[PDB]
Swiss-Prot record:
One of its GO terms (molecular function) is porin activity. One of its GO terms (cellular component) is transmembrane transporter complex. A motif (TonB box) lies at residues 1-7. Disruption phenotype: No longer takes up colicins E1 and E3; colicin K uptake does not change. Belongs to the TonB-dependent receptor family. BtuB (TC 1.B.14.3.1) subfamily. The gene is btuB. The chain crosses the membrane at residues 132-139, 143-152, 158-169, 172-182, 187-203, 206-220, 222-239, 242-258, 261-270, 283-299, 301-311, 315-330, 333-347, 364-373, 379-388, 403-420, 424-439, 447-459, 465-480, 488-502, 515-526, 532-544. One of its GO terms (biological process) is monoatomic ion transmembrane transport. It is found in: Cell outer membrane. This is Vitamin B12 transporter BtuB. InterPro entries: B12_transptr_BtuB, Plug_dom, Plug_dom_sf, TonB-dep_rcpt-like, TonB-dep_rcpt_b-brl, TonB_box_CS, TonB_rcpt_b-brl_sf, TonB_rcpt_CS. Its main location: membrane.
């Protein structure tokens, strides 16, 4: 029930005035997930289209927004993937590193800067769970996974985690190494060192290497909270022949204090990107931002706010803000209103590529949102409507020879969610409606399901832990490339069911079973790229 992402500090969800979702490891081990897209598609407002199976290019669309309009943080610390030019993928990101996910929807550019429009996904790779764990998997598609993890001090003050994981099929191979050091100076002062890298091979061949190093100091006291954090990432993406290399440096400093019935915060955020020539000659992009945040509770009312100023070495200064008010009109029920502003920064290609253009400005969004949330007869629910006007979109004029700012996009959506228990059954449902169009031409965007329905259902029989997940992906427009000109089609969307089971044998030695695409239904999220739907996975874990 504690989440950071929102304001960079620990706080209760019931305190965040905006929809959010949290995923813990335990969930991920239940769902038996081998892919970050597997753990994301299950959540509200999210749809992921992939040109095939694991390893393949995927794009994430949050609440009908474009593929690069979501912010992926890794303890964030954004996702070592400026792109390389320029949006987040997560196809090649090792599920083994994921210990938790916090996801918040709506704009948060006013804390994080450029990139937060529609959503923020914060993939965290830290944990507090001592003991060593050796696991493995064998599935039905040449899938073979082995993993070993451990966390133990070493000190009584310092603690060390080490994990190595290996996953390939037969063509996608991933190898991953992670080590960490957590030292507590006092009962309030703490620090860490983090290093990790993965080397992936994806069959034309692709070879990507990444490595990340993070170091940080934190202070959490009775009233005052502060963090100083430092990150450097190095990715090399060899395609074949091309190479993309990006080096990313980050330094940020924030503070927060408990002033009354909430807090007030502020920090400074600096980022440097070194992109190598032919990557995407070479560019060095620099961005610095400054922001302030605030949460105040006053009698049945809630107020949460952030505002930021970014100075960007190519477009200069851009400012950003957001505000929410919550009203608990009767115990258990709340009405909530939010408004927010956000931006996406021009990327290397759009800026300095074959086509223009070095003077582009950021794509800008405004978002308004209304919501009712409640606890009723044991059901925790929420329903929101939102409207998102995006403008100064960067397009390709088709004529001169360059990118410019021109198109607009309206989005109107609705999200509803509920979780509740009946028997020994737990239910977790959501519905989404995304009406995303081109505001000028008034045609549906493309690649976005107009409706999604998600249902999860968990229950224990007899020491057998069962879980069933159901998804309806609605109708999307895409393009029939096969023939030029490429025109648009309509895929009808479909239903998928997955079934996962788990048995605790003895104590440290759980055996797990999964069946994806229960009915072995054939469908595509991206026109032309066949999905792989009929896999049996069998897996285990031993703890000691
Ligand atoms: C001390 C600064 C207060 C919040 C800074 C960022 C807010 C910018 O717009 C939000 C305020 O505009 C409407 C009023 O809402 C303010 C409530 O936010 C919490 C203040 O503690
Ligand atoms: C922490 C609170 C500060 C956030 C408030 C920002 C809201 C913007 O205020 C009014 C906006 O009007 C400014 C734009 O006016 C002209 C637009 O471009 C021309 C430059 O002046
Ligand atoms: C402690 C840092 C305070 C930062 C507050 C502003 C961050 C972004 O500002 C909100 C953007 O709204 C308008 C501000 O930018 C407009 C720039 O024009 C100002 C001179 O005309
Ligand atoms: C759009 C939001 C809808 C808000 C409707 C809620 C308004 C009233 O909420 C229900 C009031 O509580 C009724 C439950 O009855 C009391 C239950 O306690 C059991 C013993 O007293
Ligand atoms: C107050 C929460 C509403 C969320 C959807 C349920 C209400 C539907 O009532 C009328 C539907 O609105 C007509 C078109 O809906 C699309 C608008 O989506 C939200 C952005 O305006
Ligand atoms: C939603 C109608 C007004 C009362 C909302 C109750 C809470 C809804 O929880 C629903 C969980 O997901 C299923 C919702 O499906 C119906 C809502 O769809 C709105 C249509 O635009
Ligand atoms: Mg002409």
């Amino acid at each position: 029930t504690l989440v950071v992402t929102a304001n960079r500090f620990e706080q209760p969800r019931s305190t965040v005035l905006a929809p959010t979702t949290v995923v813990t490891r335990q969930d991920i081990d239940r769902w038996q997930s081998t892919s970050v897209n597997d753990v994301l598609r299950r959540l509200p407002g999210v749809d992921i289209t992939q040109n095939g199976g694991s390893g393949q290019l995927s794009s994430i669309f949050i609440r009908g927004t474009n593929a690069s309009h979501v912010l992926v943080l890794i303890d964030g610390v954004r996702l070592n993937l400026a792109g390389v030019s320029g949006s987040a993928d997560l196809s090649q990101f090792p599920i083994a590193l994921v210990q938790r996910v916090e996801y918040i929807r709506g704009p948060r550019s006013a804390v994080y800067g450029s990139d937060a429009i529609g959503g923020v996904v914060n993939i965290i790779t830290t944990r507090d769970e001592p003991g060593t764990e050796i696991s493995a998997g064998w599935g039905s598609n040449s899938y073979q996974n082995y993993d070993v993890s451990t966390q133990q001090q070493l000190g009584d003050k310092t603690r060390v985690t080490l994990l190595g994981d290996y996953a390939h099929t037969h063509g996608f191979l991933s190898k991953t190494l992670y080590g960490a050091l957590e030292h507590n100076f006092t009962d309030a002062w703490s620090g860490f060192v983090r290093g990790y890298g993965y080397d992936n091979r994806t069959n034309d061949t692709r070879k990507l290497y990444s490595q990340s190093w993070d170091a940080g100091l934190r202070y959490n006291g009775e009233l005052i909270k502060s963090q100083l954090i430092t990150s450097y990432s190095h990715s090399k993406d060899y395609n074949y022949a091309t190479l993309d290399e990006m080096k990313q440096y980050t330094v940020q400093w924030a503070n927060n204090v408990i002033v009354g019935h909430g807090s007030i915060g502020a920090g400074v955020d600096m980022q440097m990107q070194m992109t190598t020539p032919g990557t995407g000659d070479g560019y060095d992009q620099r961005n610095t931002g400054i922001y302030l945040t605030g949460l105040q509770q006053v009698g049945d009312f809630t107020f949460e706010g952030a505002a930021r100023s970014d100075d960007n070495s190519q477009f200069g200064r851009h400012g950003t803000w957001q505000t929410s008010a919550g009203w608990e009109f009767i115990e258990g029920y709340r009405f909530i209103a939010s408004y927010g502003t956000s931006y996406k920064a021009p990327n290397l290609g759009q800026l300095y590529g074959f086509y223009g253009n070095p003077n582009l400005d950021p794509e800008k969004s405004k978002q308004w949102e209304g919501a009712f949330e409640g606890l009723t007869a044991g059901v925790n629910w929420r329903i929101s409507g939102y409207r998102n006007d995006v403008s100064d979109l960067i397009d390709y004029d088709d004529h001169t020879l360059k990118y410019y700012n021109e198109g607009k996009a309206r989005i109107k959506g609705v999200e509803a969610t509920a979780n509740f228990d009946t028997g020994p059954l737990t239910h977790t449902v959501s519905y989404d409606y995304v009406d995303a169009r081109n505001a000028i031409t008034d045609t549906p965007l493309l690649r976005r399901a107009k409706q999604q329905v998600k249902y999860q259902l968990d229950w224990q029989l007899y020491d057998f832990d069962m879980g069933m997940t159901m998804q309806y992906l609605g109708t999307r427009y895409d393009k029939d490339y096969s023939s030029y000109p490429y025109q648009t089609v309509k895929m009808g969307g479909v239903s998928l069911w997955d079934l996962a089971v788990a048995y605790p044998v003895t104590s440290h030695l759980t055996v797990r079973g999964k069946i994806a695409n229960l009915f072995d239904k054939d469908y595509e999220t991206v026109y032309g790229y066949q999905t792989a739907g009929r896999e049996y996975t069998l897996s285990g874990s031993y703890t000691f």
